[PDB]
Amino acid sequence: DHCPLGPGRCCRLHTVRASLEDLGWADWVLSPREVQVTMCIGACPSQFRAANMHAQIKTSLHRLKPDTVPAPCCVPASYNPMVLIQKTDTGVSLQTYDDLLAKDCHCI
Amino acid sequence: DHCPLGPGRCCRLHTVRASLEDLGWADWVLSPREVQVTMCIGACPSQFRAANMHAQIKTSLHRLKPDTVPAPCCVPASYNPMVLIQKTDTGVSLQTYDDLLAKDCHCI
């Protein structure tokens, strides 16, 4: 919360519409036909949603040695599960996947 | 495991020597005066140490829309504990941090 790069431009949840083809799942997934992928995107400037102590250090070191240490990664803090209906050789399977959709975002 | 961009060029553990000044810790941290900061640096190509399903989705979608969707990012999979001696009013504290020194790295 509060982005020094202007609203929306910092690490936050986005929804990107993807078809089975996009994912490379059209051979094994039957339903759903497309997925609203929740995903963490945006910049990670100083003190923005720092995940932990490591993330603060990363911020300070990147500011100081941009050549050696990269900016912190915008990444999921937690995930939502998803139900996939998949194809088997003789029928169908119903499977829950745990770490598929991003729930929450932080920087590291 | 095997980096498709050649030995050592993918997501792995790097060590960056840093001072308390570098870290912005001169006010509150007393010892040690220098930290061998282990962190996670490098590319995350397709199939390289993908942490979960979400990481695989990011790979797929990144090659379609690299403008819009980021590649998986190199982050700590776990940490090594670090002991810091800190100033308090009144005296000092000796404390262990579990979220400070990266132990190993994966792609998320």
Collect all residues from B whose CB is shorter than 8 A from any CB in A: 16, 18, 22-24, 37, 39, 41, 51-54, 57-58, 60-61, 64-65, 68-70, 73-76, 79, 97, 99-102, 108
B64 phi/psi in degrees, rounded to 5 = -85, -40
> How many whole angstroms separate alpha carbon A82 and alpha carbon B17?
42
* DSSP per residue, A14-57: EEEEEEHHHHT-TTTEEE-SEEEEEEEESB--TTSSB-SHHHHH
3-state DSSP call for residue B20?
helix
Reported structure resolution in angstroms: 2.3
B24 DSSP assignment: T
Q: Give the minimum alpha-carbon distance from B42 to chain A in angstroms, rounded to a whole number.
A: 9
Buried b (16+ CB within 10 A) or exposed e, A10-42: bbbeeebebebebbebeeebeeeeebebbbbbb
Sequence-distant (6+) residues with CB within 8 A of B66 are none
Q: What DSSP state is assigned to residue A69?
A: S
Contact B75 A75 (CB under 8 A): yes
A97 within 8 A of A79, measured Cβ to Cβ: no
Measured between alpha carbons, how far is A58 from A50 in angstroms, rounded to an integer? 9
Instruction: Report d(CA B52, CA A90) in Å as an integer.
Output: 28
